Amino acid sequence: KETAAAKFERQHMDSSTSAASSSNYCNQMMKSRNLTKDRCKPVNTFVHESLADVQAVCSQKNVACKNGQTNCYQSYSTMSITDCRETGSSKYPNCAYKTTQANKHIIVACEGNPYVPVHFDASV
Incomplete structure (x- = not known):
């Protein structure tokens, strides 16, 4: 199947x-990225940065995720984002x-090797 990393790219980059x-x-991107195929996804964020700059966040400030997990990371810099x-x-x-x-810091969860x-x- 689609990997989690690939899904992140499709959903968010x-x-x-x-x-x-x-x-x-948002109307165009939500549709074109297949985020509305089965249901209307209620919220989504797109990041207007290079993939390498987003991947680099996994080496930045380690923070708790909203649900308490500890594999989240906050970007040192603000990034260009679109909220839908x-x-x-x-x-x-x-x-x-x-x-x-908006221009905000992003918080992502990272996994894998x-x-x-x-x-x-x-986003904060």
């Missing part, structure tokens, strides 16, 4: 753009999202 450029960004959140008009299969652009991000925990 967008190195092709520097920021969301319109209100339709379902709107009131969303109704499967026509899932609909609000796009919010090579030790890479597998879950997006939070």
Whole structure:
């Protein structure tokens, strides 16, 4: 099957753009990344950075994840992110999202060898 690391890339990475450029960004990306195939995923974050810079976070500040696990890491720098959140008009299969652009630190959970991000925990 798809690996956890690959799933993280598909769900969360967008190195092709520097920021969301319109209100339709989330609608388009949620669909194109197959995040709406079975249900409308309610929230998701995309990171507009190189993959290497995100993978490097697994070597940065070790913190507790929101659920208490201790394999989370916070980026030293802020990163360009887009938050996507379902709107009131969303109704499967026509899932609909609000796009919010921000610069925040990210928190990811890492696993494996090579030790890479597998879950997006939070932005702060």
